[PDB]
Write a protein that binds this ligand. Sequence first.
Ligand SMILES: CNC[C@@H]1COc2ccccc2O1
Ligand SMILES: CNC[C@@H]1COc2ccccc2O1
Lengths: 268, 269
Amino acid sequence: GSLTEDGLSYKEKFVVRSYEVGSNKTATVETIANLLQEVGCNHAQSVGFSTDGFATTTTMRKLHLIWVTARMHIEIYKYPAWGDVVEIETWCQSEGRIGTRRDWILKDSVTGEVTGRATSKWVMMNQDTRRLQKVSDDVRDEYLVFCPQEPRLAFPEENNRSLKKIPKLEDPAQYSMIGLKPRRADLDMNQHVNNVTYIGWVLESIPQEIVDTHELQVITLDYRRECQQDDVVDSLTTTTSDSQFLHLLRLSGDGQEINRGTTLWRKK
Amino acid sequence: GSLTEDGLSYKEKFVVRSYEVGSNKTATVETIANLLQEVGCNHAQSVGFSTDGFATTTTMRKLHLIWVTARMHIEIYKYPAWGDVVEIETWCQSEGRIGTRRDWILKDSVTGEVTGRATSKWVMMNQDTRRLQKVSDDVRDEYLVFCPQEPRLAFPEENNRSLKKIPKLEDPAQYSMIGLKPRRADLDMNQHVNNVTYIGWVLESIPQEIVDTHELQVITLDYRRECQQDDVVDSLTTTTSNDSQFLHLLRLSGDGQEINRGTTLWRKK
Ligand SMILES: CNC[C@@H]1COc2ccccc2O1
Ligand SMILES: CNC[C@@H]1COc2ccccc2O1
């Protein structure tokens, strides 16, 4: 991978691996989410930011400030097959004092056609107290020189799925997967649960029949709270409809919300 | 990746990814096990075998026969760091009518030094009944033309760790991780639990303090039975020993049916 000619975006090619594909011989949504995260890390490295998953500046380091994901939105038109090359282009944009946005475009390296797109909203917080805060001028000046100044949106449409409000699932849930625990493979270098594990946990309550007859087209996921290594999760799903589902991840004990989301599936 | 000059082995380079590393900023043993499996699959593709993880042939496919892992042995000297390039060389050898063996050599692409090695024993089995069988001559003739004829061992030593007998852990276990279930990310294209998930499940009963102060040097794992998508696993560990040795057991949460047994060797950082 490498930054583009203007240094305002980053590109990388990936060949789909044997263990990365599902029961349809194509990449799973978790493999896709992992590749977006890898190209995002490589973009942060290429311009001097931290690489621990927090894209930290020298100013953020002294103040114990980290970038955290608040929302992830992924739309896939074609899942690459095993052995295929997928090219991902990624860039960042400042959203004033609200936070930052990372966008992605996925293409077939052979045909050049757009096979998917993603958007994510990041927010600034203290790593110790977990308190959210607005982006100050001193930290904006450090990352704005790596962002295009004119808006460049992966989801430009007025009233698109990426900015829709998500409701809280009502009990009883139609479907559920109870007792989900992270293992060491689910943790990052900082011993925190990887953001991709939550996507897998959300999809665990979708019945196998839906997975077998449909393909996942859109997934929107809000991140409310982190799941600790010793926490236990319950995954809840309800059909709201193409098939649409409303999702909720909550702690197995107290029922504390960690994530909420929506999925859209198409018939094969 | 590509087959070497003589077409009797396969090589591939991999750059270590951000999400593939652990708390030490180096590749986990599960990332290593995944890469060995990927290079093994690419070697099977390059010579016309099936790619579903079973390296079949038209003859095995006719009789519903698949290759299944009976033992995996991995020894790591240096875990590659994130951003480093690791080169893996893999080859197969026939073990007469017992089955096949797949060996691996891991090297630092920059220095050329051996940073790890692995060996695996595979056995012929009917897909449907799960019954093992000795390799027939018709099958042997199909894969021998892709194997070196003279022995080429990743673990040549006379009384080495890869061929040691593993005992069954006695109750009570010193350590345990109960209620382990596979999710969809743990399944392969054939909807079977990936062999790498069992390695992760074995390591879950090792205390976090051991992981934090030691590095995994050797892991030997026997595969007795397959874990279904709806099965629940219990991981059991007992210290048998600067070096720490453990005895492992994976069994079904209900009936206590054995699925795996193994050993690990760790050294102080
Ligand atoms: C959380 N993602 C945005 C931060 C700040 O701005 C960045 C600009 C370029 C590369 C990485 C960047 O990381
Ligand atoms: C179970 N693994 C060995 C089988 C048979 O012999 C092979 C030779 C070369 C590549 C793949 C091979 O697959």
